[PDB]
Design a protein around this ligand. Structure first.
Ligand code: 1QK
Ligand code: 1QK
Length: 127
């Protein structure tokens, strides 16, 4: 009945690299999603103590949110662009998993996911 600690966002012992892909994922993909009208419930970890969703962390064992993703990109936590893509997909599917078809929050996630898909369509190619 407590929240878990948020996902890890730093690790100064992971080797770091910059790539066109990871730069795009921050400066275009994360940025565009963050500014979307439906982004606000996805900008931080689900707070199941403030929100009254008590079974949330019984159901969602791989939490993810765009606040975390932003930190991970900023701290060069990701080596492969796909690690970041995976985290966006985990965020969307967690919303689908906890909730049910037709729920307002699921329609918000679906809209954000469609946007995600249009932006990643233009991801630069891997090195
Ligand atoms: C307005 C501030 C706020 C936002 N969430 N939240 C919650 N969340 C729990 C929750 C969620 C859904 C239904 N219910 O019934 C409770 C409790 C709570 N408070 C209870 C304890 C005494 C203080 C009082 C305000 C804080 O100091 N205040 C807040
Ligand atoms: C990724 C965030 C998330 C996942 N589930 N969920 C729920 N689920 C409950 C539920 C049930 C039936 C219909 N709907 O629409 C939702 C609500 C909720 N929030 C409260 C309502 C305003 C937005 C938003 C704020 C806090 O993240 N946020 C979330």
């Amino acid at each position: 009945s407590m929240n878990p600690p948020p996902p890890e966002t730093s690790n100064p012992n992971k080797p770091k690299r910059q790539t066109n892909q990871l730069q795009y994922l921050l400066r275009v993909v994360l940025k565009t999603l963050w500014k979307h009208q439906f982004a606000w419930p996805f900008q931080q970890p689900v707070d199941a103590v403030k929100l009254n969703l008590p079974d949330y962390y019984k159901i969602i064992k791989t939490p993810m949110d765009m606040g975390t993703i932003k930190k991970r990109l900023e701290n060069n936590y990701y080596w492969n662009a796909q690690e970041c893509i995976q985290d966006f997909n985990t965020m969307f599917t967690n919303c689908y998993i906890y909730n049910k078809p037709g729920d307002d929050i699921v329609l918000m996630a679906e809209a954000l996911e469609k946007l995600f898909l249009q932006k990643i369509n233009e991801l630069p190619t891997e090195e």
